[PDB]
Amino acid sequence: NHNAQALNTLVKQLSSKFGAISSVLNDILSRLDPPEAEVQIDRLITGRL
Amino acid sequence: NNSIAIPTNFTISVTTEILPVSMTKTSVDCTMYICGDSTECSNLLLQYG
Numbered sequence: 001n002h003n004a005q006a007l008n009t010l011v012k013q014l015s016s017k018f019g020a021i022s023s024v025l026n027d028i029l030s031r032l033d034p035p036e037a038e039v040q041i042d043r044l045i046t047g048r049l
Numbered sequence: 050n051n052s053i054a055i056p057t058n059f060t061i062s063v064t065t066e067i068l069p070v071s072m073t074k075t076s077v078d079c080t081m082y083i084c085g086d087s088t089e090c091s092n093l094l095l096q097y098g
């Protein structure tokens with residue numbers, strides 16, 4: 001149960017914005033130009049890392 | 050090859066051994082520590098999963 005719960009928590013962490021406009025990379029890429037989008041992608045990368 | 054040392058007397062020794070068993074049980078209020086009495090900070094903290 002501990003291992004399964006750890007994996008489930010790791011999966012559910014993917015819905016967090018971590019301060020970005022959205023938690024979905026495709027939405028960030030579609031709604032912003034590359035330079036601005038790089039900042040939001042960096043925030044998501046840091047959170048997921 | 051033909052000499053042996055045999056004790057003719059004894060001694061009763063009382064030694065002391067100290068072993069830790071438990072430590073302090075601590076609890077942390079995450080919101081109070083990070084965002085003590087701040088609604089904006091709490092709402093931003095909700096973003097971090």
Ligand SMILES: *[C@@H]1O[C@H](CO)[C@@H](O[C@@H]2O[C@H](CO)[C@@H](O)[C@H](O)[C@H]2NC(C)=O)[C@H](O)[C@H]1NC(C)=O
Nearest residue numbers: 053054055056057058059060061062063064065
């Ligand atoms: C074995 O050792 C004990 C002490 O560790 C000896 O007892 C002592 O004997 C002397 C002389 O008889 C006394 O002055 C002490 O008061 C004794 N000490 C204690 C704690 O009783 C004992 O005599 C030794 N035995 C042999 C056969 O040598």
Ligand SMILES: *[C@@H]1O[C@H](CO)[C@@H](O)[C@H](O)[C@H]1NC(C)=O
Nearest residue numbers: 050051052053054055056057
């Ligand atoms: C026993 O010990 C002596 C010296 O302690 C040594 O000279 C001798 O060789 C030993 N015994 C054997 C069979 O080697």
